Symmetry: none
């Protein structure tokens, strides 16, 4: 009961967890880095004072982020990650038998090196041949190269007003930069911020509405992540249908993904993509489009 | 930015809400009773230090507790609430036009009288001619009367041994005391503790497993409640099937409930009753049964 | 263990007390006002988020503030309070059989009315004929009037850089404004901020050194105030000696002050005015003078 | 601005220090042992959740605990420490050139070995040829040997009934066990718990009163320790007078102690031994005596 880390989740809400230790600390020109050893969530990565992942339940976030998008692809071969310097998004992709190239594109070199050093769970992932790490802004990287991708995975910080990841959620970026870099039948997926009954109105609905204005087929979904103190959201978007039964999803999982999933099976994702009445109404009637 | 209500959700985990006011603090012998005005969640009812009800989202808990059971029933007319002293369970039940009688059986008259005066959202419910309030242990009340119900709602605290509420979750209780007091097609629903990816193993899986020893059809389901900082769980149980589509649930809601639900539609319930892989696997392989 | 008020004492130090209730709240154009009912200290007056007094131990602060200065006076008749809108400084003065006029000069009208309404302990003091309340800046009040005072009591907020009470601690203010308004044999006393082993270097030593450059006879003293989470300091300053035995102080107390003191007797003040080695060395060798 | 060490000074009062690091956490069967690097107070030794020693101001506690007793003694040559496993009491005692032997008797070898390696400020003290470390209950040790001391230093935890340290504050202990082991002119000093205007009534006044039943001259005294968020108290006791002026204390400090004290001079001690009116009146009228 003596040592605590404190997180301001909202203006009037704090989330405190007891600490075993402060394990490692780095920093870039971009942000403060810390790896805490927490009692309730194990090793916790804190970036600029915000918890970004925790050892006990990061598998939920990263299984939800990655596996729905590639399972709805018939044959996802190359995948570009915006963000995801932690290595866990790459880890989950690399268990798919169909990728021949994961590029992880994080602008913060020091975050990648830190997590490559200290997250035991991803060093098999980091030392994988299919994996290429690029230090650059994601839009700058995509505009400059011309190689189109089967799947693009958005694993950035939330689009807070005045940050630099904001422009990577804009309607003009999807339509003019990202989608031209999708192969025919490609699939985009992005994390989409909090998806609680009230918190989904911050960014989750706006990212849904924005992707509605670029792709014909958009599916939002969400799942509780305990260490984030909220339901968290993701959005899929493609121009080919993303409609698979739970049974087909289970079939494709036991065929393309090495090892058994800890959190996600077909029925989990069916349930995940059935938002609640209020969240569904809010999403289906949102107007704002990030320009 | 200086006054806070703190709750230890877990002994190593704290959830803190900024405070506007402390509207009342007091106590019975059963529990301390506080009503707080919080900035994130509005007025919050705290019993023995544990938030039980927040103004901004208690509708989620109460709609989930109540509606699924009633909607599944062919025509629910009389209901017994084990607990429910805050008035919000009764309030949601009284939204159903098919209901003719609600009996609220809470052991702590202090809680009942406090909420009757201070939880004004429940005022019309407390004054509804169909509601009867009984101050008794629920088990004693149900054994003391030979009356049966179409639905019995468990709205008690989480089972911890030695508490007055533990015995209301045992196999023996469900089978020798509760089930005899359900009419044909009758449905039992109880709150079933936290149901998060790890917290569900405390009581949720055991309550599911226990009811599975007693009732033909047992349906667990869960939903996020922000003020609880967790997924919360409930369990339906009946000897008649519990098997309606989202569309059939919705037609019934439009026909039987006055006003629109704020949280629950038929698709929400189907989603809620589809648990995640690990939670499903846990409840499937669960071994423990509650007993005395 | 559930409701807490939190005070940042220093940058890295917080001081939290459990709450029975938030009793009353006002505000002026100048500051936020709150009266909390706290478990460890009872009713607590919080001004702009800082605890300024608490019911359990305010008697220590106000007995220490007031009684040493007037006891070293042979016959203190009129007394001007800078600040002290709480009423407690006036309360303690009014138990002296020798004052014929206490003027309390606080710039915040709403603070005076609030404490006059809600501090039960001072409404006998507030409805006392000898007591005159003036709403004005203290320097403006003193410059404009020409009536000289036996004693002037500094009961302001600490001289934080950039506030408006800072100039009321300057060497030019003592020499050119305050002291001309002292009668012959007059005595000034001011609260002097924290007086802990390390915290005394914030302002306590600077106020001592400043008053050394205006009055011939200056005595600093301090006492623990539990609700302030620190030793607190006061300074006396006169041009006549302030040297009385503990026995004479006890004599003068049982003769001039109605009722028995709760905290302060002669020996207490002797001990109070014997600072510790490090605080004494720091004070006796400080250079900065508030100009 | 995000990592904090929290301590409940009182059950309704919390004192929180911002953290740099947690250098070690561990435990013996007697207590949990933690060493924290805090921003306000530097490295802090926490035993069973209670801060016992902070780097920025432990000198206050240890100088006050040790020096007055030794300075009052005509020539203190051998000293027994009840407790003192952190090494800082020994360190201050070994600053006196008149000292020939220090025996540190702590019940928890875990604490001793931990501080020996991690409290480097005490390293030379731990390696001083005049120090002997004994791992035993202090009462058992003192009864087990017929050796007397010029000074005995009580550096144990505050007396709470049932603890292994309560019996080291009883009248019987002081009179039948401790006093026989003091040489002529011998002086006993113990830490005596909080001594604030209200907190002094917990143990401070009782310890004073107890010693007053056993020793001719009993001198209580106190001093603020910021990391403790309170005034802390100590009590001198002897059957020879304890009556030196501030100037005589200072001459002795210059003659007997190597290096300059950071907190304590003769005037500081006289001030410390002049208690406030309410604390004086409380200790004067105190009735309770510790017993078994």
């Amino acid at each position: 009961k003596s040592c605590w880390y404190e997180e301001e989740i909202e203006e009037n809400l704090r989330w405190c967890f007891a600490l075993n230790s402060i394990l490692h600390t780095g920093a870039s020109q971009y942000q403060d880095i810390a790896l805490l050893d927490t009692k309730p969530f194990g090793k916790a990565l804190v970036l600029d004072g915000k918890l970004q992942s925790a050892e006990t339940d990061e598998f939920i976030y990263h299984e939800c982020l990655v596996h729905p998008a590639l399972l709805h692809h018939p044959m996802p071969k190359n995948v570009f990650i915006m963000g995801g310097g932690e290595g866990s998004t790459a880890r989950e992709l690399l268990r798919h038998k169909t990728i021949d190239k994961v590029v992880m594109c994080d602008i913060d070199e020091e975050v990648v090196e830190f997590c490559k050093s200290y997250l035991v769970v991803n060093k098999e992932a980091f030392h994988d041949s299919r994996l290429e790490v690029v230090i650059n802004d994601a839009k700058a990287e995509l505009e400059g190269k011309e190689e189109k991708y089967d799947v693009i995975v958005g694993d950035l910080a939330d689009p807070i007003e005045g940050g630099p990841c904001y422009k990577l959620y804009t309607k003009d970026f999807y339509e003019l930069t990202l989608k031209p870099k999708l192969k025919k039948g490609g699939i985009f997926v992005t994390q989409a911020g909090p998806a609680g009954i009230f918190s989904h109105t911050e960014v989750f609905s706006c990212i849904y509405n924005t992707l509605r204005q670029v792709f014909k087929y958009v599916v939002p979904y969400s799942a509780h992540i305990p260490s984030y103190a909220d339901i968290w959201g993701w959005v899929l978007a493609s121009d080919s249908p993303l409609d698979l039964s739970a049974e087909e999803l289970d079939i494709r999982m036991r065929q393309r993904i090495i090892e058994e999933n800890r959190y996600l099976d077909g029925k989990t994702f069916v349930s995940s993509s059935t938002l609640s009445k209020a969240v569904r109404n809010s999403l289906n009637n949102e107007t704002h489009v990030y320009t």
